[PDB]
Design a protein around this ligand. Structure first.
Ligand SMILES: OC[C@H]1O[C@H](O[C@H]2[C@H](O)[C@@H](O)[C@@H](O[C@H]3[C@H](O)[C@@H](O)[C@@H](O[C@H]4[C@H](O)[C@@H](O)[C@@H](O)O[C@@H]4CO)O[C@@H]3CO)O[C@@H]2CO)[C@H](O)[C@@H](O)[C@@H]1O
Ligand SMILES: OC[C@H]1O[C@H](O[C@H]2[C@H](O)[C@@H](O)[C@@H](O[C@H]3[C@H](O)[C@@H](O)[C@@H](O[C@H]4[C@H](O)[C@@H](O)[C@@H](O)O[C@@H]4CO)O[C@@H]3CO)O[C@@H]2CO)[C@H](O)[C@@H](O)[C@@H]1O
Ligand SMILES: OC[C@H]1O[C@H](O[C@H]2[C@H](O)[C@@H](O)[C@@H](O[C@H]3[C@H](O)[C@@H](O)[C@@H](O)O[C@@H]3CO)O[C@@H]2CO)[C@H](O)[C@@H](O)[C@@H]1O
Length: 95
């Protein structure tokens, strides 16, 4: 069973960050943790260390105060691998 929370994110932002609360804990210090270039063009990625059965709530930003926050609701990610593209989350890698 999956542990870490791994996220692929479709963006053209050069300095994308993920700001998050893991398992309802503290929010990261703004602007959060950078995502890194992925193996897929147009996607960056990050793996957030977590235990089995974890979930985090997240808002993305461009490292200079522009946001992607799911209509103000934030995005929910669970343990395992998911891809966020254009506001929609699916399991696994870029389609
Ligand atoms: O590469 C082809 C495309 O390149 C350009 O798109 C870029 C944008 O310039 C970037 O700003 C960024 O897009 C941001 C977007 O600016 C931001 O609002 C946000 O959009 C989300 C939205 O929050 C969400 O609720 C849902 O509607 O999906 C949106 C994305 O569709 O997040 C974006 C991602 O960080 O990155 C895109 C490339 O991914 C150019 O403008 C496009 O016309 C061109 O096709
Ligand atoms: O604490 C000792 C440090 O003092 C000096 O750093 C100062 C800067 O000179 C100030 O400008 C400011 O820095 C801001 C910065 O202006 C701002 O752009 C932002 O930078 C972020 C960025 O948004 C984010 O996307 C990511 O890239 O990280 C960047 C760095 O965090 O935020 C800065 C504050 O975090 O304040 C700092 C001190 O806090 C001196 O230059 C440093 O060498 C020294 O360590
Ligand atoms: O809700 C309106 C509120 O928005 C602004 O507050 C933001 C902070 O300025 C910002 O730092 C961030 O706070 C988080 C910290 O970064 C993190 O270290 C930690 O302590 O969790 C914080 C959130 O719980 O986000 C808040 C909320 O957007 C603005 O400054 C406020 O005046 C305003 O009331």
């Amino acid at each position: 069973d999956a542990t870490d929370i791994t996220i692929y994110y479709k963006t053209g932002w050069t300095h994308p960050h993920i700001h998050y609360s893991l398992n309802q804990g503290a929010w990261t210090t703004l602007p959060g943790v950078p995502l890194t270039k992925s193996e897929y063009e147009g996607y960056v990625k990050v793996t957030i260390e977590a235990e089995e059965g974890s979930q985090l709530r997240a808002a993305f930003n461009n490292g200079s105060g522009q946001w992607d926050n799911n209509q103000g609701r934030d995005y929910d990610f669970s343990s395992g691998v998911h891809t966020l593209a254009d506001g929609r989350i699916l399991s696994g890698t870029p389609k």
